[PDB]
């Protein structure tokens, strides 16, 4: 319930500014590996809850080769967390492999449901 267009509007304001990118991007990096989804072998875009119909849409527009790997790193996480262990340190998701692969499939489904409601309340000036 935070609507990724609004995250990326805030988030791109931080990265664009030179002052705030020096300041709270190193806070953001230390926040990521303290969370430790990498240690379970997940990227971030496995963690997003898939029960709203916007995110339910963007998991159908995904290609087959990425929706097969994403459907494996989830099952490796349900198997690792079941044993109350972590993944071995070679199997951890590294920094470069943690890319927003599902972000552009959401921002084109969010803007396509924003336009559906901006156009369902249009008031035509006569």
């Amino acid at each position: 319930p935070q609507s990724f267009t609004s995250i990326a509007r805030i988030g791109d304001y931080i990265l664009k500014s030179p002052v705030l990118s020096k300041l709270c991007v190193p806070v953001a990096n230390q926040f990521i590996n303290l969370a430790g989804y990498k240690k379970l072998g997940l990227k971030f875009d496995d963690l997003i809850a898939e029960e709203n119909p916007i995110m339910q849409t963007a998991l159908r527009r995904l290609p087959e080769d990425e929706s097969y790997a994403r459907a494996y790193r989830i099952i490796r996480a349900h198997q690792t967390e079941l044993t109350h262990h972590l993944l071995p340190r070679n199997e951890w998701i590294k920094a470069q492999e943690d890319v927003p692969y599902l972000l552009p499939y959401i921002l084109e489904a969010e803007a396509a449901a924003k336009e559906k409601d901006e156009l369902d309340n249009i008031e035509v000036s006569k």
Binding site: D117, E118, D120, N121, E123
Partner: protein, 44 residues
Amino acid sequence: KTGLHFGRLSLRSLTAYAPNLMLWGGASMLGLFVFTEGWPKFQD
């Protein structure tokens, strides 16, 4: 231009119900005077 919506209940679908919802607030205020007048409760 776009009217104020906030999800489902837009303003245009609320200005057309506020004449009738003023009658449901009268039809429920008389709904209390059936089920309470019978024990002393004076509303004014």
